[PDB]
Amino acid sequence: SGAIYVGNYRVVNRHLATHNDWANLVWEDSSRDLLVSSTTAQGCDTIARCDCQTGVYYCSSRRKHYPVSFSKPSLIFVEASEYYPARYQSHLMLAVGHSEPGDCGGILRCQHGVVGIVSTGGNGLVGFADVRDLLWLDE
Ligand SMILES: NC(=O)[C@H]1CCCN(C(=O)Cc2ccc(F)c(F)c2Br)C1
Ligand SMILES: [Zn+2]
DSSP states (O other): OOOEEETTEEEGGGOOOHHHHHHHEEETTTTEEEEEEOSOOOOOOOOOOOOOOOOEEEEETEEEEEEEEOOEEEEEEEOOOOOSSEEEEEEEEEEEOOOOOTTTTTTTTTTTEEEEEEEEEETTTTEEEEETTTTTGGO
């Protein structure tokens, strides 16, 4: 689990969004596994607007942060799960690192701010949903 709180927005994995997230919906995209809802309190996070390919992410299954080298946001095949049919997920960045079910929502950050959140994993890989192109989160 996990979320990004920026301005008056909360960014979460679409498959983990709550009844409250859907009742306060701003935008969602099933092909990206993202959902953004509105908040009454001002957020704690700031968003990176960069092309970094290295960063540090939080891994809840190890209660630890790990450094990673990750690919540019791209279209990647994701096998069927109880949350989605087999499909191509867009704006996804892969890296070698630990992840297991429960790790979605962990934040990836570079020196410029928040880059994205854990969205996929397995086999010694971890996938992050990029949020750097969502310029409206800042305004
Ligand atoms: N973005 C998706 O389609 C997600 C939806 C939930 C299910 N997805 C997973 O990847 C679950 C998973 C499996 C094995 C792992 F080792 C792991 F870390 C994770 Br997270 C795809
Ligand atoms: Zn950066």
